[PDB]
Structure formats: structure tokens, C-alpha cells
Symmetry: C2
Subunit: 105 residues, 2 copies
């Protein structure tokens, strides 16, 4: 058991996520922002490297609040890792916490 | 790309036993008789307890446990109107991999937890 603390440098991971988001908040379905963000991010990570499997998890929150995430795995691997990123939409009153988890093949 | 279905019957154990596994782990941390001499947060202790109990039930799966902690400052949390949801997607499709979501509230500490369990078939 290991609490987790990459295939891409972190700065690219930020760009990857922030662009997917801005491209949504810039739709005739009822798909949510969070579900659309998840699909975008997984597409683009898949294009970069096939050496990993990817999980993208998004908590949506709709004042003084803090939003944190923790993640543990039942196995240990220095090649598996996570990245957390927070996104806000001050006008629609919504906060997004996205976590990327990569599983080395 | 597959959005994982939170209400699908995939788990190595029935949902009822998943709820119990999680609630009891949580109750074991909030019990007034418990002493934590480490600096590990409730969320991180919950994750360790839940993964332990999942490993004992079935070794045929790898498990991931993710906890979001909402902490509200400046008003009592039961007087606030908010929603706290989670969605999860994976880069591959396994009919045997699945997820389960569960919400725990601590009204007295102005805290809400959203726990997600992911099982990956080996």
C-alpha cells in the first residue's frame, strides 16, 4: 500500500489540462464540463505516450472553502504517479479538481 | 476511452459490503476512543484502511482509493448549499474494472469527503 505523491513534464501536463478546459468554456448536449474535460485529457495523453495507461478523475464543486485530493494504490511502483490540478469558474460558481494517474505498462 | 460507471455491478464483492467496508473504516477513525499519534490526515488514514480491507477480500485486483476532502470555513457546512460530484475515465476498456463512489460528511468539523474506489482486474 502506497500513498501516491511521468510520461510528460509537469509543465506540459498543466498546458494539456488548461487548454482542454479553456477550449470548453470558450454545446447542444447535456454532457457536463467535467465529463467533456475528462475525454479531452485522455485523448491527448493517449496521443503522447502508449507506454502508460491513464485514469482521469474530476471532482466538481458548485466564501472560504478548500478542496483537496489524496490517492493511494494497493501496490508500489516508482513509475506510477499522479498530478493534481485545480480549475475555477468564478462566474458559474464552480471549482474543478482534476487528478491524472498514470500506470506504467 | 471509457467513462467508468459508478452504478455498475463489477466489484469483487457486493456493493453492500463495499459500503460497510468504507463506513466502518471511517467510523474507526472518528471513534472518540481513537488516538492518532502521527500527522496522517483522516483522508489518508481512510485510504490505507480501505485498501487493506480490499486486498484481504480479493487479490485478483489492484485497487486505487481516491478521497476528496472539502473543508468549509466561515459558515457551518450544513447551512451551505453546494453539490460535490466525481467523474472518472480510463484510457482503456475492461468490463472487469469498475469504480464505486461514496460520500461521508462530518458536520461537526465542517468537512465532507467523497471517496472513489477503483478496482483493476489483474
Amino acid at each position: 500500500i502506497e500513498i501516491k505523491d511521468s510520461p510528460l513534464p509537469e509543465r506540459k501536463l498543466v498546458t494539456l489540462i488548461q487548454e482542454s478546459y479553456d477550449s470548453l468554456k470558450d454545446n447542444l448536449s447535456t454532457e457536463s464540463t467535467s465529463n467533456l474535460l475528462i475525454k479531452l485529457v485522455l485523448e491527448k495523453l493517449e496521443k503522447h505516450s502508449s507506454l502508460y495507461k491513464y485514469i482521469a478523475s474530476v471532482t466538481t464543486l458548485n466564501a472560504n472553502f478548500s478542496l483537496k485530493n489524496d490517492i493511494g494504490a494497493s501496490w508500489e511502483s516508482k513509475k506510477d504517479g499522479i498530478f493534481n490540478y485545480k480549475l475555477e469558474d468564478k462566474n458559474n460558481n464552480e471549482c474543478y479538481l482534476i487528478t491524472i494517474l498514470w500506470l506504467h505498462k
